[model samples]
Target chain A: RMKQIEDKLEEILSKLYHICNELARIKKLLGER
Target chain B: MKQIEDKLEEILSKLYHICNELARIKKLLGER
Candidate 1:
């Protein structure tokens, strides 16, 4: 049961990380200096 | 200040509204 939730969390985290990375890229392009 | 929960509710509503405002700001800030 615990391992099952952990696996689900890993999936969600991966998707979240992708979105964060995309935002970071755009922010960098926008000259977040 | 707990004498009247109404004022507190008003303040809370204003704060809640502001939080939604902030969320909208973030969404628009992201979308735009």
Candidate 2:
């Protein structure tokens, strides 16, 4: 029941982590990092 | 659990806010 939801939640977090990495890359390229 | 449902809602809301906010940053970054 909740296990599936838990897995989905974990997936969302990792995707968000990727988004953060992308943000960092943009900042680095912009020389703001 | 009910709390988990609420937690999901909170995070989803946060994700949208983060995503929505990114458009502006990306556009502004492109300007430079």
Candidate 3:
């Protein structure tokens, strides 16, 4: 049970990381475009 | 085993909410 829980957490973390990168991209879009 | 699912659920909800906020910001940004 615990392993599954951790797997989902990691999945969520990966998504959060991608969104963070997207936020950075958006930041530059806001600044340079 | 300790009951730890709540913490994970909390993080997921927070991430979901943050996505919603980001979408709003993107909308405010307007056409590319």
Write down the DockQ of candidate 1. Answer: 0.02
**RMSD to true structure for each model, in Å:** 18.1, 19.6, 19.8
Of candidate 1 chain B, the 10-residue stretch with the lowest lDDT total is: B1-10
Per-residue alpha-carbon lDDT of candidate 2 for residues B1-32, written as tens digits (9 for 90 to 100): 54554555566567668765654555455555
Instruction: List runs of model 2 lying over 4 Å from the truth.
Output: B1-32
Worst ten in a row by lDDT for model 3 chain A = A24-33
> What range of 10 consecutive residues in model 1 chain A has the weakest lDDT sum?
A24-33
Native contact recovery (fnat) for each candidate is: 0.00, 0.03, 0.03
| Chain B TM, every candidate | 0.70, 0.77, 0.76
- Which ranges in model 1 have alpha carbons more than 4 Å from their true place? A1-33, B1-3
Judge the docking of candidate 1 as incorrect, acceptable, medium or high: incorrect
Give the better candidate number (2 or 3) by TM-score: 3
Top candidate when judged by lDDT against the true structure: 2
lDDT of each: 0.52, 0.58, 0.57
- Candidates, DockQ: 0.02, 0.04, 0.04
Candidate 1, overall lDDT? 0.52
Instruction: Write model 1 residue lDDT over B1-32, tens digit each, in one string.
Output: 23343454455456556555555555554554
Which of the two, 1 or 3, has more TM-score? 3
